[PDB]
Design an enzyme around this catalytic site. Structure first.
Site, PDB file in Angstrom:
ATOM      1  CG  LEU A  30      -1.833  -1.226   1.365  1.00  0.00           C
ATOM      2  CD1 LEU A  30      -2.314  -1.320   2.788  1.00  0.00           C
ATOM      3  CD2 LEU A  30      -3.018  -1.134   0.419  1.00  0.00           C
ATOM      4  CG  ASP A  31       4.117   3.429  -2.498  1.00  0.00           C
ATOM      5  OD1 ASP A  31       4.259   4.408  -1.729  1.00  0.00           O
ATOM      6  OD2 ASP A  31       4.942   3.117  -3.379  1.00  0.00           O
TER       7      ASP A  31
END
Ligand code: 017
Lengths: 116, 116
Positions: free
Chosen positions: B31-32
């Site tokens: 998750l970026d």
């Protein structure tokens, strides 16, 4: 606060960064949950202070001499929190002068991702 | 849910990815919030499907022929959702085998960053 996520607007924040070698400076950093460690531009430092060689992975691979480590801790004040974040060390970008706030700094603010 | 941020533990999720060129696969994705666009491993596509060339940012500069773009949209389903995220286009990793959920997908989940 709550920061909405949008492909077309980068989640940035204004931070006062004290490297302990000049007076503190204000920069605009990207808030990056995919970064393990904070990155700050070498433009913040006096040209004399020493740094250490290091390694780190990136989109086009990992670099050798591109990024350096600080020898002294770095202090960071955000607009809301009154106390400074204190990083034992963080990365210094000698080329592109990137400014990125990573999970080391986000943990000290008790930051979270929230997916409803 | 709430995903705490820790420099020592990458924030990952399990996601079913449907390239529309092969059968759907569940993979582990990072998750970026620092990624404008979602990245998918080339292994999830057909050996016959066509892709398009383009550029990308990344630690250490930008790469030319490391990432391609999809020709068809990609659908992504999360554990806590049955309606699929629909990305009209996203990046394809031809070498490193990265799976990264970026802000294009996080916007459709209504995901947010929260700093107390
Ligand atoms: C796989 C990750 C570890 C990649 N990284 C964080 C990521 O958010 C970077 C952070 C980033 C952001 C902008 C420019 C350079 C780097 N952006 C990125 O590579 O995403 C690209 C794919 O989608 C595109 O949309 C914009 C970003 C592109 S990283 O920059 O290489 C990195 C890795 C380790 C540390 N300590 C600090 C930074």
């Amino acid at each position: 606060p709550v920061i909405p996520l949008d492909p077309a607007r980068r989640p940035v924040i204004k931070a006062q960064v004290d490297t302990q070698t000049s007076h503190p400076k204000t920069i605009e950093a990207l808030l990056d949950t995919g970064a393990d460690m904070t990155v700050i531009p070498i433009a913040l430092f006096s040209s004399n202070t020493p740094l250490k060689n290091t390694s780190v992975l990136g989109a086009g691979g990992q670099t050798q001499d591109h990024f350096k480590l600080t020898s002294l801790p770095v202090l960071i004040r955000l607009p809301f929190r009154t106390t400074p974040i204190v990083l034992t060390s963080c990365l210094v970008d000698t080329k592109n002068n990137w400014a990125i706030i990573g999970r080391d700094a986000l943990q000290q603010c008790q930051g979270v991702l929230y997916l409803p």
